[PDB]
């Protein structure tokens, strides 16, 4: 049986699994006030990808395909292709194409295009409103509010590179985006299918441990907090090793290699999330070279030391 | 520890010189230019070289604070570390880790957050890595934006790369130059602590490149980007730290659906791949194929002529 293990990459060296930005800090807090059901960064300890999770860290929240539009309009509808430019298959047992954003908000980026015949290129500012009734990636259609009305050509490879999020400064500050509100993947009236399950701390006195980044802001006063359940490198690691889980909870220990001492211990649940023994909101101040270390398989009733 | 390579397919991996996915394998002659990239450099036992770091998304990104001349639109960014700590130019590196390693015009977005109230702003920005004021080693990078007053001073500012451009009036695909290193300390300066140049020395062998297409934002730019190692291989070698028992490692690219060995290649200890072929050619691979480490062989090992 292949022994289980977690990567030794520090938090700063790892990528957020819900947006192509690096991880900044570890965070813990109560999660009863909302539903923790992200579709990206979902992977079991034995390597089963869940939800909309794929393996490329840079292709989260990116779209590929061809664009059309009503003549004279700045809104462009993109017919989604695969990441390798192949035909999108809307019949796969997934909530949406792999890497589709799993939160409701306004993502601002750049829409780029290349004309195949002569290699001419163009790029424009573009924003996708994942909460809009027109957002339907599962059906293969996504709309981009751009700053041009005639520059993008039809039947040419077009790509959206995400940059950050925006917010209407005239409304309540930090009211957008909502990182714990899943988009409507096939339209405002349809129902999401094949979703990865929701996640909540079950042991009394335990809270989820989030891997937190700060999304770049492009306009207004956006809520730039983004918490993922697993680093993208851990999703890549478990998918490759596919080591069988000997129990339902893998006990991890955070170690400072400058001293060897254990700073805290946490539960890595088989379904793919982390809990710690703590009550209340708190950012974790870790050494720059700290890392997680698998130590032993325990059960679900194990009692962690009250840290983290 | 025994040596091994990741089992990720080519399309599941990231280019190590730009935050974009890999698209195909490519081989060709490399005697007409100097192959000396600084990103995506890592020995098989996990020693990072040049400006290579571990984050696939922190490649070609910049962080710091911006100032500018009143009325002008080129902003000067005083660089900070990737984690907003102060920049230390005394480190034995050619430039901050993740600095672009090619001469060209990278276009992206400059975003900024005012700390006191959380107000944000973003503008189109282009960095000219061939310009005289491109001195990341000294901690200074110039950005040409589309606003002349909107960026505030003493506030955290980040550049997110998107693609490349070129002057549409000049010859097509003359820019960028992916095999021309920028001057990391300014126009007149000389680079330091560079990763060594790479050339296939075995007779009949050529470099195997992991190729991506950089997005184009204006003009007719040369969008080919070749890296010597996928970023996931860099992350893997750094963690495994498996010692090298020879100077070349024999890898086999295999289709897990049929067991067919599709080609053979050498993974050199310094961190690059060679194949037995003459001429330029793209490699058409099945979507599930991946590299598998076989054994440490000697340097006079002759690969099967393929790929």
């Amino acid at each position, epitope marked *: 049986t292949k022994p289980f293990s977690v990567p030794v990459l520090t938090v700063e060296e790892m990528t957020n699994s819900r947006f192509p930005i690096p991880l900044e800090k570890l965070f813990t807090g109560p999660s009863s006030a909302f539903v923790v059901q992200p579709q990206n960064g979902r992977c079991t300890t034995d390597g089963v990808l869940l939800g909309t999770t794929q393996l490329s860290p840079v292709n989260i929240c990116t779209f590929r395909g061809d664009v059309t539009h009503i003549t004279g309009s700045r809104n462009y509808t993109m017919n989604l292709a695969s990441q390798n430019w192949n*035909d999108y*298959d809307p019949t796969e047992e997934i909530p949406a194409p792999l890497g589709t954003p799993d939160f409701v908000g306004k993502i601002q980026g750049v829409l780029t295009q290349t004309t195949r015949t002569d290699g001419s290129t163009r790029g424009h500012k573009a924003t996708v409103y994942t909460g809009s009734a027109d957002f339907a990636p599962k059906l293969g259609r996504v709309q981009f509010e751009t700053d041009t009305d005639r520059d993008f050509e039809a*039947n*040419q490879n077009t790509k959206f590179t995400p940059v950050g999020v925006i917010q209407d400064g005239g409304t309540t500050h930090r009211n957008e985006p909502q990182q714990w509100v899943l988009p409507s993947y096939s339209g405002r009236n349809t129902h999401n299918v094949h979703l990865a399950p929701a996640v909540a701390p079950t042991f009394p006195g335990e809270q989820l441990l989030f891997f937190r980044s700060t999304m770049p802001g492009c306009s207004g006063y956006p809520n730039m907090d983004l918490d993922c359940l697993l680093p993208q490198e851990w999703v890549q690691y478990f998918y490759q090793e596919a080591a069988p889980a000997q129990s339902d909870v893998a006990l991890l220990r955070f170690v400072n290699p400058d001293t060897g001492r254990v700073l805290f211990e946490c539960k890595l649940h088989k379904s793919g999330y982390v809990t710690v023994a703590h009550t209340g909101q708190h950012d974790l101040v870790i050494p720059p070279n700290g890392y997680f270390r698998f130590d032993s398989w325990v059960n679900q009733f194990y009692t962690l030391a009250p840290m983290g | 520890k025994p040596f091994s390579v990741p089992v990720l397919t080519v399309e599941e991996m990231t280019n190590s010189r730009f935050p974009i996915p890999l698209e195909k394998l490519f081989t060709g002659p490399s005697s007409a230019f100097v192959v000396q990239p600084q990103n995506g450099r890592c020995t098989t036992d996990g020693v990072l070289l040049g400006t290579t770091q571990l984050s696939p998304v922190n490649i070609c990104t910049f962080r710091g604070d911006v100032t500018h001349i009143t009325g002008s639109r080129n902003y000067t960014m005083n660089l900070a570390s990737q984690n907003w700590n102060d920049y230390d130019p005394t480190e034995e590196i050619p430039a901050p880790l993740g600095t672009p390693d090619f001469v060209g015009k990278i276009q992206g977005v400059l975003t900024q957050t005012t700390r006191t109230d959380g107000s944000t702003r973003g503008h189109k920005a282009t960095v000219y890595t061939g310009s005289a004021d491109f001195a990341p080693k000294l901690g200074r990078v110039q950005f040409e934006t589309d606003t002349d007053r909107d960026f505030e001073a003493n506030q955290n500012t980040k550049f997110t790369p998107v693609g490349v451009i070129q002057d549409g009036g000049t010859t097509h695909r003359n820019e960028p130059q992916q095999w021309v290193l920028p001057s990391y300390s300014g126009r007149n300066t000389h680079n330091v602590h560079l990763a060594p140049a790479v050339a296939p020395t075995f007779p009949g062998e050529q470099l195997l490149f992991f190729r991506s297409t950089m997005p184009g934002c204006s003009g007719y730019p040369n969008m080919d980007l070749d890296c010597l190692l996928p970023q996931e291989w860099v992350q893997y070698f750094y963690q495994e730290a498996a010692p090298a028992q020879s100077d070349v490692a024999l890898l086999r690219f295999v289709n897990p659906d*049929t067991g067919r060995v599709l080609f053979e290649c050498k993974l050199h200890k310094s961190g690059y791949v060679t194949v037995a072929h003459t001429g330029q050619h793209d490699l058409v*691979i099945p979507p599930n194929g991946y590299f598998r480490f076989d054994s440490w062989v000697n340097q006079f090992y002759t690969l099967a002529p393929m790929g």
Partner: nanobody
Amino acid sequence: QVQLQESGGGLVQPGGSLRLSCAASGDIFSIYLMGWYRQSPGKQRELVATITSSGETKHVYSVKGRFTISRENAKNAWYLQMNSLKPEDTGVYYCHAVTGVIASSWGQ
């Protein structure tokens, strides 16, 4: 190692339909990408559609919704259902197969 022959061309009226076939033989177990190409007059050989052994398809923008690629599970033959044919579809059609990273075989 692999040799192919196409069959199904000819004259048809605009808006009509043709079904092109391509027969393979000899170690078709090695084939992992099956495609169709066409050679319009005055232009270079361009791709029409591809399909992998797993069934992953790609069509070009000019034929989206009109053309359809399909293959037998034994990879002894793959087809191209052309519907609603326009004057721009005129040209010689070659069926294509990929046997190795460099190796490939064309039709007559």
